[PDB]
């Protein structure tokens, strides 16, 4: 075997280059204004004072915040980032093959793992000892060869995040599931419908009739004193979000810790 | 007695030839587009853009999927197929006259039964020992003369499915009950009514009035903001399905296993 | 007996060639825009400002996400893919004929199985020892001849997925049920109905009346301040999805693990 | 196995079909025939109609509605009759039992 040093092919296979984490963008995961507009096919949002359509700056803003919402509704790291953690010694888990659970998951790869004292490395574990479980967020060592805890004894550096899926309809444990993309889209779309619901009719109108010289024109709109113009669409989007979240909260597990 | 080898007249009587399982078709069980159209007597489904009636390809498609639904709402094999199973040794059931429960039922006939080791037959049981209970899905042996389990010791081949009934109003345990046919029909019909419900009026219309020069024409349709055009028929079909399923889930028993 | 090496005819029969996993497509499973459009016979989805029909790219996108959703509502792998797993040693299950449960099911075939240490094979199990249960997702060994657990001792390679069924109305345990196709279709169709429900009528209109020079028209739409134009169809599709999911969650079992 | 048709009016031997089971089977058939017929009483999918032409005016309200089909009432009554008959017949035949 030959490999780039930390990335032992069995225990810590390389999944991404540290150059690519700066090159990946939201558009590479398919989150783009065009996708939102596709879900709003046959609708256009434009300023009634000017006819100007809504700018892609707003779409990208909403998309980035929707990504943040998805990254907090589930205890996951969606976008690749380098994580540096200082973790505590605990006797039970240290005896349990040096078990540590990362704060962020999935793990793309582990970059460094050391035992240290006042920042001095006391030991540097050989990379061939590192065992990584990517979707779980678990790291262990399997060596080839006065108190129960102490603070910040373990120094851990790793890359968290998810890669874009390589094939249609499929994902590896380190690849974003196809439906989490749709969840983020639904979160963005739920905001866009709230914007659009103000512009179907003049402000604050639920009904109008206008008649001139016996020509009569009359409208009942979807607005009402209770429900906004986009009420039904938002309700449906919330149902879809509920189904998607149930599915994804089955894919990622329940959080647990041993006291 | 004389018989074709595996089909001992008492313990494993022959009910079908292995040539016929390729010749049987859905139409031989009476599932046909004409039957569906009979339940939709006095209605026609046609494309309003062309007047073309709906093609029998769609009916046969829906029928085949309705058969699949019926085969999963009940833990049964409707259509004849050859099953090959590798079954585990369990000490209690092996001592209980070599009891095995087939994964699929009814049994039309058992084709082979052997005890084996790495695919080598260790013993081939004489066909005159085989005891079959067809509707239950049970096979036993009644010989004329370090662990509690082991994987895939038993090799079993059999035909599962049901035959079309020979007489009106009657069925043998290996023959399809007359009402399971109607259940499959009701499942198909529930889809056809969902298609038809879109075409009774122009899209999205609940009411119209049109008046020209004092001639007045006015319609209230069965569509509404809540209920679709075929709501009532689907509700009735669901009631009928519920009655049929209760009856058939009394005919086939509750599933049980001994741990 | 003669066979391609890993694929012992009794314990691990070959069901697919590794060339075909690149060639199979959504269309081979009957997921196509036309298969969706068939369920909306007599409707067209059409931009009211241009008359252009919606492009099939959106249909394919929705289908690929609907497959992802179906693969998360049920704990299954639908489309064939090659899985590589490093699995932990557990003493109880290792003693239980080297029992391992795959993360993904069904198993089409096992490609490699080894016990290893830092990537070195410590032993390579003869293929004639491998016992596979495909729909369960179980692998065991039946040999011909200081701690309770250790990480990543077992190396397992296999193909997960389902093949398209070979006969009408029937599936082998490694073949896709006919009703799961209908489930994925219904998931796509729910989204297409959400799109189309905005376009049946002028946006945000619940009632209209126009009177001009002795011609009068009044229309009530299925749109309302509470319900969108396609509410009814979506509700019925959700009922169908619920029935299908109950059936499929009876076909696949409840997940269980021994702690 | 089976039953013979009864030899006297209003009476059955234990091997003869009860008169009410005949009515049960009739009611089961009739429920389906009413489901068919309930689509045809009126133009398909019409709940209300009004027509006015040259001083002739007609308005019709049908038993069809966005909730209920045209034969809903008859089917409901037939289901009540079926329920009564089934209670009676499940008193005539006993509860199933087995010794384990």
């Amino acid at each position: 075997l030959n490999y780039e040093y930390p990335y032992h092919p069995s225990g810590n296979p390389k999944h991404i280059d540290v150059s690519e984490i700066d090159n990946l963008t939201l558009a590479d995961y398919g989150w783009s204004p065009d996708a939102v507009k596709a879900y709003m096919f046959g609708i256009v949002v434009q300023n009634p004072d000017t006819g100007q359509p809504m700018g892609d700056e707003f779409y990208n803003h909403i998309l980035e915040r929707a990504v943040g919402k998805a990254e907090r509704a589930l205890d996951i790291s969606i976008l690749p980032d380098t994580q540096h953690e200082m973790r505590d010694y605990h006797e039970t888990e240290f005896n349990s093959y040096m078990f540590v659970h990362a704060y962020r998951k999935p793990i793309l790869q582990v970059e460094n793992l050391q035992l240290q004292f006042n920042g001095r490395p006391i030991y540097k574990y050989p990379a061939n000892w590192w065992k990584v479980e990517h979707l779980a967020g678990h790291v262990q060592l399997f060596p080839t060869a006065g108190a129960t805890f102490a603070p910040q004894m373990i120094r851990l550096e790793y890359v968290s995040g998810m890669l874009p899926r390589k094939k249609a309809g499929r994902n590896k444990p380190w690849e974003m599931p196809p439906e989490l993309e749709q969840l983020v889209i639904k979160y963005a779309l739920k905001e866009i419908y709230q914007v659009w619901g103000n512009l179907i009719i003049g402000a604050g109108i639920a009904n109008k009739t206008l008649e001139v010289d016996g020509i009569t024109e009359t409208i009942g709109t979807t607005q009402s004193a209770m429900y906004g113009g986009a009420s039904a669409q938002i309700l449906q989007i919330n149902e879809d979000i509920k189904e998607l979240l149930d599915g994804l909260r089955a894919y990622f597990g329940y959080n647990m810790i041993g006291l | 007695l004389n018989y074709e080898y595996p089909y001992h007249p008492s313990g494993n009587p022959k009910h079908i030839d292995v040539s016929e399982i390729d010749n049987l078709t859905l139409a031989d069980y009476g599932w046909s587009p004409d039957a569906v159209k009979a339940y939709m007597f006095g209605i026609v489904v046609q494309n309003p853009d062309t007047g073309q009636p709906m093609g029998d390809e769609f009916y046969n498609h829906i029928l085949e999927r309705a058969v699949g639904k019926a085969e999963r709402a009940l833990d049964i094999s409707i259509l004849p197929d050859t099953q090959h199973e590798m079954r585990d040794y369990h000490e209690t059931e092996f001592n209980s006259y070599m009891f095995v429960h087939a994964y699929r039922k009814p049994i039309l006939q058992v084709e082979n039964l052997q005890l084996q080791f790495n695919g080598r037959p260790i013993y081939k049981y004489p066909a005159n020992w085989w005891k079959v209970e067809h509707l239950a899905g049970h096979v036993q042996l009644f010989p004329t003369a370090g662990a509690t389990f082991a994987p895939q010791m038993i090799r079993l081949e059999y035909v599962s499915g049901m035959l079309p009934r020979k007489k009106a109003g009657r069925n043998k345990p290996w023959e399809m009950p007359p009402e399971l046919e109607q259940l499959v029909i009701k499942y198909a019909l529930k889809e056809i009514y969902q298609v038809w419900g879109n075409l009774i009026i122009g899209a999205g219309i609940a009411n119209k009035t049109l008046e020209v020069d004092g001639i007045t024409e006015t319609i209230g349709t069965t569509q509404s903001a809540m209920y679709g055009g075929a709501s009532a028929q689907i509700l009735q079909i669901n009631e009928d399905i519920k009655e049929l399923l209760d009856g058939l889930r009394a005919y086939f028993g509750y599933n049980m296993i001994g741990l | 007996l003669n066979y391609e090496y890993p694929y012992h005819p009794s314990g691990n029969p070959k069901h697919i060639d590794v060339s075909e996993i690149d060639n199979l497509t959504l269309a081979d499973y009957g997921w196509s825009p036309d298969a969706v459009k068939a369920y909306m016979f007599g409707i067209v989805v059409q931009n009211p400002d241009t008359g252009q029909p919606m492009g099939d790219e959106f249909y394919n996108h929705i289908l690929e996400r609907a497959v992802g959703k179906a693969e998360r509502a049920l704990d299954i792998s639908i489309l064939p893919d090659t899985q590589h797993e490093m699995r932990d040693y557990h003493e109880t299950e290792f003693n239980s004929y080297m029992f391992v449960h795959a993360y993904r099911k069904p198993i089409l075939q096992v490609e490699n199985l080894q016990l290893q240490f830092n990537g070195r094979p410590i032993y390579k199990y003869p293929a004639n020892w491998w016992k596979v249960e495909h729909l369960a997702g179980h692998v065991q060994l039946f040999p011909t001849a200081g701690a309770t657990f250790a990480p990543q001792m077992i190396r397992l390679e296999y193909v997960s997925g389902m093949l398209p069924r070979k006969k009408a109305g029937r599936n082998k345990p490694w073949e896709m049920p006919p009703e799961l196709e209908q489930l994925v279709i219904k998931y796509a169709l729910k989204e297409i109905y959400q799109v189309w429900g905005n376009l049946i009528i002028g946006a945000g209109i619940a009632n209209k009346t126009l009177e001009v020079d002795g011609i009068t028209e009044t229309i009530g739409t299925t749109q309302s301040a509470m319900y969108g134009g396609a509410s009814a169809q979506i509700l019925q599709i959700n009922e169908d999805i619920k029935e299908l999911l109950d059936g499929l969650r009876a076909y696949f079992g409840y997940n269980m693990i021994g702690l | 196995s089976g039953m013979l048709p009864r030899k006297k009016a209003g009476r059955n031997k234990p091997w003869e079909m009860p008169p009410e089971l005949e009515q049960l089977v009739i009611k089961y058939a009739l429920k389906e025939i009413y489901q068919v017929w309930g689509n045809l009483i009126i133009g398909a999918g019409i709940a209300n109609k009004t027509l006015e032409v040259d001083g002739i005016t007609e308005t019709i309200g049908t038993t069809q509605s966005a909730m209920y089909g045209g034969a809903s009432a008859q089917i409901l009554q037939i289901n009540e009759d079926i329920k009564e008959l089934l209670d009676g017949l499940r008193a005539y035949f006993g509860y199933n039992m087995i010794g384990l």
Partner: peptide, 20 residues
């Protein structure tokens, strides 16, 4: 390979009821 990402119904009088 790559993931896909971006009538007739007539009104008429009942003439028998008109005769009645």
């Amino acid at each position: 390979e790559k993931p896909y990402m971006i009538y007739t119904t007539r009104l008429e009088f009942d003439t028998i009821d008109m005769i009645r």
